Structure formats: structure tokens, C-alpha cells
């Protein structure tokens, strides 16, 4: 894990950090959720033409069986597993993860 876990940072800062125009699309980081306490979040930068650079945020909910998920069909025992999976194939994500955000 490590590289990509940014800790307790705000939605505002993650966007500030992901909207850097030299970041490739699919740059990401995992933070804590400001809105839902106990849940994390995956902030991916995307580039739609017309809207320009933007950031999609996905909430990673945890189950008491000890697994994380964004969707329920796919569950992971580990947030590092989740990152690995979404790096290999987007499978619903706006873009597969390609890059651990700089800092």
C-alpha cells in the first residue's frame, strides 16, 4: 500500500492535487471520507472534452465481514487489492487507475 494512501485529506485538497494538468488521466489517490465516517474514497482524475480535467470520487464502503467495495459485485479484502484490480481493468470505473498522484 503506502504510495497512494493520502490519509485524512479533504475532498477539496484531493481535487487541488489531482487537477494538475501534467497528471495523466487515471491518476488517483485513496483518502478518508469527509462525509461518511468509517468509509474511504478513491479520487480519480478524468478528462472529458467540454468539461475538461475533472475528478470522479468513489466511496469505498467496508463490510463487517472485513471487505471493501465500491460496487458489491466486486469485493476486495484489502484496499491494496482494490487498487491493483482497478489498475488492471477499469470495470465500471471512469478510467482504469494509471498513476499514483504526486506529492
Amino acid at each position: 500500500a503506502e504510495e497512494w494512501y493520502f490519509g485524512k485529506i479533504t475532498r477539496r485538497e484531493s481535487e487541488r492535487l489531482l487537477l494538475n494538468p501534467e497528471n495523466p488521466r487515471g491518476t488517483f489517490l485513496v483518502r478518508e471520507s469527509e462525509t461518511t465516517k468509517g468509509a474511504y474514497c478513491l479520487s480519480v482524475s478524468d478528462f472529458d472534452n467540454a468539461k475538461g480535467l475533472n475528478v470522479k470520487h468513489y466511496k469505498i464502503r467496508k463490510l463487517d465481514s472485513g471487505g471493501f467495495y465500491i460496487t458489491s459485485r466486486t469485493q476486495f479484502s484489502s484496499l491494496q487489492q482494490l487498487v491493483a484490480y482497478y489498475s488492471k481493468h477499469a470495470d465500471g470505473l471512469c478510467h482504469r487507475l494509471t498513476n499514483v498522484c504526486p506529492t
Partner: peptide, 7 residues
């Protein structure tokens, strides 16, 4: 705040 959901 809005969050994306996988469809």
C-alpha cells in the same frame, strides 16, 4: 457532495 457509482 456527489460521488460516482459504478452503474
Amino acid at each position: 457532495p456527489q460521488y460516482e457509482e459504478i452503474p
